[model samples]
Target: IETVPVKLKPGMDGPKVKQWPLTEEKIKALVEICTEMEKEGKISKIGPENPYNTPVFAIKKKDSTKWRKLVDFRELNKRTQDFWEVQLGIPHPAGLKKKKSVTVLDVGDAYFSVPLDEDFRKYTAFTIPSINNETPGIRYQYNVLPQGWKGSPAIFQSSMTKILEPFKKQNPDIVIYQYMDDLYVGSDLEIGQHRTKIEELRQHLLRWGLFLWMGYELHPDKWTVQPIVLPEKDSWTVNDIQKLVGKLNWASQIYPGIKVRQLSKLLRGTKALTEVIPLTEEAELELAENREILKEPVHGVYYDPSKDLIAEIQKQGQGQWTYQIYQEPFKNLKTGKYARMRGAHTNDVKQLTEAVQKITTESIVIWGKTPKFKLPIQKETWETWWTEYWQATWIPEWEFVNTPPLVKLWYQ
Candidate 1:
């Protein structure tokens, strides 16, 4: 069934840019990203020729009580909506921001196409000369496709949800959600617990033939803590001291005034009561000094200088002089911290490779139990698979590698 496209005006107010025009450059970039993702084994191939004719299922609330299958009206929707109207009309919403008390994960590019069955794959014995010939394995959705076809988002979402079902079941405490391929996994728990959950979820997805981007992380402990808190007088934790401090800082930025200064002072003394307020600059300096005074060396080595060392310097007639010096220390504070924490997080190649390997192993286990037939149940499944495998794997690479010298100039 064809879907009707929603019409939107120019410069509509929204969180994200409503209409992103797809230029040739944009398409090239998308192709590059998709190619990279395929090479990385993030997505599997659907054959160029139609595969199988699998029955489609849809969940719908029935008036009489039970859920019902909503018939696929994709063809109908496509016929009703004009191409330009569909492309510009439908809106794509952005997911939650990075800093909010939410878990955020990204699923890379998920390429989708229309299902092809044997009947549909056969050359049409049609009378109409105007009808466009059906192409094998080309995605045709009602909306959310390249040109705003209906049901593209819904279909894509359904596939993702299916793959992630196992992970979600294993991770009960963790909440996982997705918009297209961008998945977010979050939980309101301690740092160690959160990290464990993230790792578990990551491994689960990888096992399901899905791979996360390299930069994904278990939100850092310090970053995970809410910067601001508000509580009602009736509710004790309603007004978090840290949250109040954040508000004061925000107010200082937008409107520098006396109230900010007064609150700043209240947050300063040595007593426990003063500690209820957020630390001010003076308080921080004082605390640092106190920490130094009370500090004691542990088992680590301590360097000491003797009177003879001092005598050696005096004997050399060393003159005390103030001079600006610049030296790149081999073992300095910056390098020291980098050495300690560089491989501790998600971005490290070793950690990412391990995660990917674990995920792939898991996916194979799951796939072993599940049947793998070409989707849509096409009659010529083997032919379709061979065509699709060749096209997906080789065509793009061939185009890139075999371009003429003159064509390269045009690209530049």
Candidate 2:
């Protein structure tokens, strides 16, 4: 949910700066979660490659009064979408709008459900604080995939889709839909067919180490996903921010012209994506004030773009140089109308313009050479500096684009 790439500025303070304040209860929960993770072959330690030394934070669950150990991996956020979009031209196995019976299944530890190779796991290392209370934090990488890592969903889902391909071929009547961990099984055949097929699908994942977490249900008519009431004030905690980040992302994507979909400072301590930094009274206010654009659009400019806006920032590694067409904080030619064109990835003039036109209630703009940015990786950092920050298994793309296309958060 921290869309801002966890990039360090020129003199930005180094990482591993803050520690999660864990209660006795939260500590026990952390121990339990970490223990389970290791026991189930989810997290291991060290890599042949240089470890990023990503810090771990604990977030308490509102429902269970529990805390789950999480690492600050927003750097991996932009890369996730690219993995999932690999099958864009081909129809996904699920979602026949006409199918009558629907069953939703959740993949527990969605990313971890799919195993990671030893080669890929090492670079994702992080330190989990004092699970035993007597000891300090422990160092570990991933055994299976970690929650936030580049190509996590793409690798997981593509593998999952392949597993289900046999099922797709066998069961001509069934359709499958997956968004991260949630899987929807749809079929017009008798409920008996879906029930049996879901059972088989559940077993296939179990056979491969992924477990079934049953609780999700179908709501075809369901729309709004944000809180019934946006809180007047809230504290930022590891857990709370986790939920808030995930919640605000789609909400911002769908809402008309939202600024950077925010995570409130409702302050815990300095860590804008981890590391020390102080925010002022007015600074925090603008953070909260502008963020409300997603919730209350009445006091705003033509909204949207913050999603792609963040992506643009990461694509070019925070500079106006090296990029010919794609600009930092990406926007175009200054109009009341912002051109949230695909300035980096694809320069398909006819297709991208049609895309902008499809979303905006505005005029046509000029063409570009590419939507993908030419990243200016500095000479020293290429192999000598942090490898994890600059390299990726895949990059941010508009696959699973926040649709039916709305005004982007572009500065005209």
Candidate 3:
């Protein structure tokens, strides 16, 4: 099996974050899946002394009764080093416009096909929920690539790229585009020629002992657009936003003039996975536009190379800014440096100002904001305003436009 190295940031040990509790039913399902995965040589039980451990949980696979197990790797992701040099080739709609037939080849259990290096498997260790709450659950680390890790996609894509290089060279005339584990093969030639090309590619992939499955052939003529279901309530959760955005993004590939303006507006203040935000009026109007687009009689769009692609960029007015400080400063054992922790939402400017003064008086000012400074006015003036006037004041969301677009940042 192919493997990739997973490196942690310099002077960092690992995450010691708190775990999320699980229900009895969820625990049972997770145990079942873990046992099956162990049989398949995907995971192994580890000793309790391992320094790194992340909580594991499960969510339902879309519209299905089966569960999809996932690890809470948010903290680990912040500490992991990035490997961005790998090539991830994506297919363009214009390239497939003239093709009469298109077939998508999906690799089964794609991420698990590649194994993680032995020395780095400890970084991927996850804890399973115990059946009884009195005792601590055992830890199991992944031997193969697991979902929810930030490095998994790039590592897997790199491996797939190496595997497909020879096939690309052998069939220089074939139009096959690779996106991670899926391959899009399109042809404008006769049906027999298309079938032969697919067969040759399948044989090439099978030589590497990979699990290949055929996704349906996309016929250029009979593509239909499906109706989209909008959120029922005025406020939407982070999960709701992710689902809606993913659906609309795929729809944009089929619907040429799909408007994404409102969708971008809906994601402005969303910072955490558990936060709920009220939808704005402009966003609601965009949702209505999406519904109308889906209701159109003819659905699929054909790309025209002759037509010019024009992009419009408009600078937004009164852009908002947020600032936050952790509850307390803690020293990391491995790095031996004082670092501010997340998951603490504090609105006290005095504490933040003190932290800035104690840690890095001159250095913090430049690192405070990447694009621009947090407050345009003097620090003393803003501190006085917050303490004297804005303290214990009640203001509605609409009233934000009248004042500075300053909001305290919150974390999960």
23-99 per-residue lDDT for model 2 (tens digits) = 46545665677788888877765543443556555543222344545565544443223432344433443244335
Which scores higher on lDDT, 2 or 3?
3
lDDT by residue (tens digit), candidate 3, 268-326: 77479768867778877877888788666434233232332211111111221222221
lDDT of each: 0.30, 0.43, 0.54
Residues forming the 10-long window of minimal summed lDDT in candidate 2: 361-370
TM-score of each: 0.27, 0.42, 0.42
Worst 10-residue lDDT window, candidate 3:
391-400
Task: List, residue by residue over 259-354, the lDDT tens digit for candidate 1.
Answer: 434434544444443233444566455334433432322122222211110000000011111111011211110000012222425333232222
RMSD, candidate 3, Å: 20.1
Cα displacement (Å) at residue 41, model 1: 14
- Count clashing residue pairs per candidate: 36, 16, 0
TM-score attained by model 1 = 0.27
- Which pairs of residues have clashing backbones in candidate 3? none
